[PDB]
Assembly symmetry: D2
Amino acid sequence: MSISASEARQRLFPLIEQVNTDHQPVRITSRAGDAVLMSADDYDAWQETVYLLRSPENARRLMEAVARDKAGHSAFTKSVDELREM
Amino acid sequence: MSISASEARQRLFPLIEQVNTDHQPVRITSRAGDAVLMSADDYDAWQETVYLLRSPENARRLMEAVAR
Amino acid sequence: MSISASEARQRLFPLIEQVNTDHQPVRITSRAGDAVLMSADDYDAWQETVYLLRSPENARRLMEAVARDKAGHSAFTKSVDELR
Amino acid sequence: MSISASEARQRLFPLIEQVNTDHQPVRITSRAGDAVLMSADDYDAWQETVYLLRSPENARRLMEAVSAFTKSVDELREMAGG
């Protein structure tokens, strides 16, 4: 979860499998500054949902969609549970 | 809507049905500060979404799930 | 810690000053439904600051702009002065 | 503007430098799946500001961060810290 740009340039393939599995960002350090590698799905999803949050009513529309079905229930309970653990 | 504090005071109960129905906030003017009246479900969903947005993976999980 | 709509309609004015002085939203419970009353400023800032994070890269520019706000007009003029 | 991991591997050092100079993220595509590389300072601002936004008070404070009067603040400051 933190490594030199030097160790990361060798190890990009497994770092990318990594961020896409455990969904944990990787800090890459460097003399010319530090960087974060992350799952590109996660990042994109994060942007696109903030895109939809133009107002409280959209946040409400999101929660409902989540309340609609059993897969919504699953995904939302796991998120709250993640939260509850930290 | 967009009204005065006295206008908002006498009209307060229909304002609460209005907010719970059209989900639009109501801007109340007063020389003591402006205020917004919004539905409680809207407020709670907004604040909850923002809290859940702490983890980016959560967004991806909100997304994947609606699409189920 | 909520208040009934009837108590709210009564005390609207002091509720309004108070939502703006202490900036804490008040929850209103009624037979007509539930509401939250908060300052227009908290509400505008909530919506706009989220809109700005549409690009995660705005976060740092928000942080720095607010830092330049707290610095004062003072920091600017000195910048201007350091010269060619 | 996405590059292959095989490209990212080659110019990893200038890429890290770019991301931090430009304050723009880079999308890396690879046989191992997709990633986004971003300045660490800016990832951090981003996680922190979303954390702060839970609260509408903190949000207000991000919007609203902001003489003879101002003179005397400076005077008191100095008096209080000298």
